[PDB]
Amino acid sequence: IQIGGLFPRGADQEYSAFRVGMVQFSTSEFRLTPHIDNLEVANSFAVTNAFCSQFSRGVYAIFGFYDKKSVNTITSFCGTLHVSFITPSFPTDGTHPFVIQMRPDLKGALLSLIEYYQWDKFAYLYDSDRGLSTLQAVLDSAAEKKWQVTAINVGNINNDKKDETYRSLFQDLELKKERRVILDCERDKVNDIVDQVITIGKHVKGYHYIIANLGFTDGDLLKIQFGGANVSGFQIVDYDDSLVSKFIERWSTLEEKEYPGAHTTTIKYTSALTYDAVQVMTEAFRNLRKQRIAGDCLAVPWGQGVEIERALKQVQVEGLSGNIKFDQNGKRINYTINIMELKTNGPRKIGYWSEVDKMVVT
Amino acid sequence: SVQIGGLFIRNTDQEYTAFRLAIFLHNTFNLVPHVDNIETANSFAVTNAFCSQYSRGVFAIFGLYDKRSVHTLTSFCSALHISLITPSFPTEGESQFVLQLRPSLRGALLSLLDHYEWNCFVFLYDTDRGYSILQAIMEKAGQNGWHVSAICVENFNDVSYRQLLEELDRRQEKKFVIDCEIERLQNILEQIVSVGKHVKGYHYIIANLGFKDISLERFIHGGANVTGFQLVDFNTPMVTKLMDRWKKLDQREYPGSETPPKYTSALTYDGVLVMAETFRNLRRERTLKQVQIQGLTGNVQFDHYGRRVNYTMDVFELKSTGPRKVGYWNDMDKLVLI
Ligand SMILES: *[C@@H]1O[C@H](CO)[C@@H](O)[C@H](O)[C@H]1NC(C)=O
């Protein structure tokens, strides 16, 4: 058994979580081979070269990341070759087969908390790197329900004038008398945005700030805490269950000399998705061995397309993210997302979002 | 060779760095330092160190003291007829054989509060530099019928600071006057932002000589009015020459060669220059007090009690583009505005 990897540059916590998942899920009966690579997912040529190199040595399954400018290439290559590609990246739009997806969809929850809080005429600050897949839904919902959106494109900003531009955005919104904004950017961006918020002020009472990036316990809220402004967010990894407590008990023990990181109390959601991917993949091959069951990329399907794809897509397990069970397409179907809000005290649970019931308050 | 004594305490590493800089550059009548650094500034260790320095033989001691150990050091210096040049906080009353380089901030602060014409404000203070400022403020408030709420913040933690700030927010004060140490002032400034008071409507008065030595960029962007004092002049070619030569030395022995000097470093350098002038004049106590020199902090001259006279200090206000000088304070001409 061999299982490759196309992990991106600038990411080290994810690969540390990957090796920790390798160590934790001990398998004497069979052992896989990582053969990990490293490159910039934003460049298509390197991605194609690495994919071809992995395919040239008969890898059974590949596991890596991508972005908006490289998802189509991966999807097209995996469709023709029947090689499954497990990814904790953003959910793709449309039925793309043979791409197992291990991230819940933010959409639907941001539209169920924006109505539990009865609002209208809100502000929305989107980024043009993740993709125009969440803003479009917001525009559609606003058109359907007569809401008024004020879209602002954060990102694609020069670092020299990043402070000035971010400050000027809030200064301009002050003129229009807008007090509700919806921030949805990666941790690096949202940290800078909230820092500039605090620099201008706006952390006094009378302002409500939703973070729409899952997580919400890894953006250093200590700066924005102990103020008057409201803070609300979504969370996927609850930090009080038996499994997560057992994980964090051994998380701090390992040192950064061999395993980078692993000394802080909180872990990013992407690394948790990677660690759960390790388990769901090992158990997927376990089920096949219980059932007793290549040339160049520029050349025919290989031996076992369905035997691997359907087996990996029919898994039912429980991990840090919660229930893990995939539907026909490969997206999560039985996921629950915790609702949290920030007070003078740390984050407190407010409810949960699920498919079976729209919105729950507790 | 002329023997000099050096006494320093903890958390004053830049003081020792400036002293070593002054000694090195002045000698390169070579001075002979007798530095004996002490960790805790208590009476017993200071007395023992002074005894050792005196027994080895010293003509003048440059030392630093705090509230607790000032009395013993001054008493022994007056008793043994050994001149002591110090940059610490000035004392009150008659004092002999003690030279003090730090000017008193009482007059300038009183003139500033007179200029803005305030009748109710909050005064945050600590007792690390005596009770002179608090007593002067209370006397002036009693004479002029003011309303001051002095609060001691010596033993306050973050929770206490935030709760006190919220309680003072409940009342309408809107005007604060801070007088504490550098670290305490930094803590106050980093916890006043979290509450959200770095906004237009408040007017803080930083009462020290290090207005440009602290980072106020957050207040600059906020727009809240801030007024402070400055003693060291940066456009003089003398300070630029000294600072460039500081850059030309290594950083493994003289750290701080990347920033303009604070008030204490300039004070120590001026004290070293005054002491060297005193020795050179003596080559050809009474002679010590007759010195008149041009140091980094301007004109240096002392009266019969060793206090500063004929000293100029600029007053700065925080604007959108940064600090902007608005005038200067002098003893003979009081406050002068531009
Ligand atoms: C903050 O939360 C409280 C309690 O839910 C709510 O009444 C208030 O309107 C919120 N403020 C803003 C600015 O949304």
A207 Cβ closer than 6 Å to some ligand 1 atom: yes
Which helix H or strand E contains B167, and what residues bound it?
helix B158-170
Q: How many angstroms is it from A208 CA to the middle of ligand 1? A: 7
Question: What fold characterizes domain A5-103+242-325?
Answer: Rossmann fold (3.40.50)
Class of domain B2-103+236-301: alpha beta
CA B144 – CA B120 distance, rounded (Å): 11
CA distances from B314 to B231, B300, B308, B325 (A): 6, 16, 16, 7
CA A128 – CA A135 distance, rounded (Å): 10
How many other C-beta atoms lie within 10 A of the C-beta of residue A62? 23
A208 Cβ closer than 6 Å to some ligand 1 atom: yes
B4 and B58 Cβ atoms separated by less than 8 Å:
yes
Q: How many angstroms is it from A230 CA to the middle of ligand 1? A: 6
| Nearest by Cα to A319 from A353, A268, A354, A280 | A280
Class of domain B106-230+312-337: alpha beta
B150 and B178 Cβ atoms separated by less than 8 Å:
no
CA A225 – CA B61 distance, rounded (Å): 50
Question: What fold characterizes domain A110-235+337-361?
Answer: Rossmann fold (3.40.50)
Around A225, how many Cα atoms within 13 Å sit in the side-chain half-sphere? 15
DSSP class of residue B14 equals H
Choice from A113, A120, A177, A208 to test ligand 1 binding pocket (greatest atom count within 8 A of CB): A208
CA B306 – CA B320 distance, rounded (Å): 40
A271 and A17 Cβ atoms separated by less than 8 Å:
yes
In chain A, which segments carry CATH 3.40.50.2300? 5-103+242-325, 110-235+337-361
A48 and A73 Cβ atoms separated by less than 8 Å:
yes
- Tell me the nearest-neighbour CA distance from A222 into chain B, angstroms: 9
Sorted by sequence, the CB contacts under 8 Å of residue B333 that are 6+ apart come out as none
Nearest-CB residue to A200 (from B162, B194, B221): B221
Distance of CA A326 to the CA centre of its chain: 16
Judging contacts by C-beta atoms under 8 Å, the chain B residues touching residue A200 are 221-222
How many other C-beta atoms lie within 10 A of the C-beta of residue A14? 19
Q: What would the 3-class secondary structure string for chain A be?
A: CCECEEEECCCCHHHHHHHHHHHHCCCCCCCCCCCEEEECCCCHHHHHHHHHHHHCCCCCEEEECCCCCCHHHHHHHHHHHCCCEEECCCCCCCCCCCCCECCCCCCCCHHHHHHHCCCCCCEEEEECCCCCCCHHHHHHHHHHHCCCCCEEEECCCCCCCHHHHHHHHHHHHHHCCCCEEEECCCHHHHHHHHHHHHHHCCCCCCCEEEECCCCCCCCCCCCCCCCCCEEEEEECCCCCCHHHHHHHHHHCCCCCCCCCCCCCCCCCHHHHHHHHHHHHHHHHHHHHHHCCCCCCCCCCCCCCCHHHHHHHHCCEEEECCEEEEECCCCCECCCCEEEEEECCCCCEEEEEECCCCCEEEC
For B217, nearest residue in chain A (alpha carbons): A199
Task: Give the strand order in the sheet containing B322-330.
Answer: B147-152, B120-125, B175-179, B203-206, B225-230, B313-319, B322-330, B334-337
How many other C-beta atoms lie within 10 A of the C-beta of residue A35? 14
- Flag if A199 and B162 touch (Cβ within 8 Å): no
Beta pairing, strands B225-230 & B313-319: antiparallel
CA B284 – CA B277 distance, rounded (Å): 11
- Look at ligand 1, atom 4, and give the residue with the nearest C-alpha: A230
Judging contacts by C-beta atoms under 8 Å, the chain B residues touching residue A167 are 221
Please list the residues that pair with A231 across neighbouring strands.
Answer: A209, A342
Three-state DSSP state, B290? helix
Residue type, B219: F
Q: Which residues of B297-320 are buried (b: 16+ CB within 10 A; e: fewer)?
A: bbebebeebbbbeebbbbbbebee
Beta strands in B18-110 (DSSP E): 31-32, 60-63, 83-86, 98-100
- Look at ligand 1, atom 6, and give the residue with the nearest C-alpha: A230
Provide the residue ranges of all domains of chain B, joining segments of one domain with +: 2-103+236-301, 106-230+312-337
Sorted by sequence, the CB contacts under 8 Å of residue B267 that are 6+ apart come out as B87, B101, B102, B297
- Flag if A200 and B218 touch (Cβ within 8 Å): no
Question: Which region, left, alpha or beta, applies to residue A120 given φ > 0 means left and ψ of -120 to 50 means alpha?
Answer: beta
Domains B2-103+236-301 and B106-230+312-337 are alike in CATH topology: yes
- Flag if B196 and A204 touch (Cβ within 8 Å): yes
Around B298, how many Cα atoms within 13 Å sit in the side-chain half-sphere? 19
**What kind of experiment solved this structure?**
cryo-EM
Residue for token pair 């080895």: B56
Q: Which two tokens stand for residue B19?
A: 């002293």
Judging contacts by C-beta atoms under 8 Å, the chain A residues touching residue B218 are 199
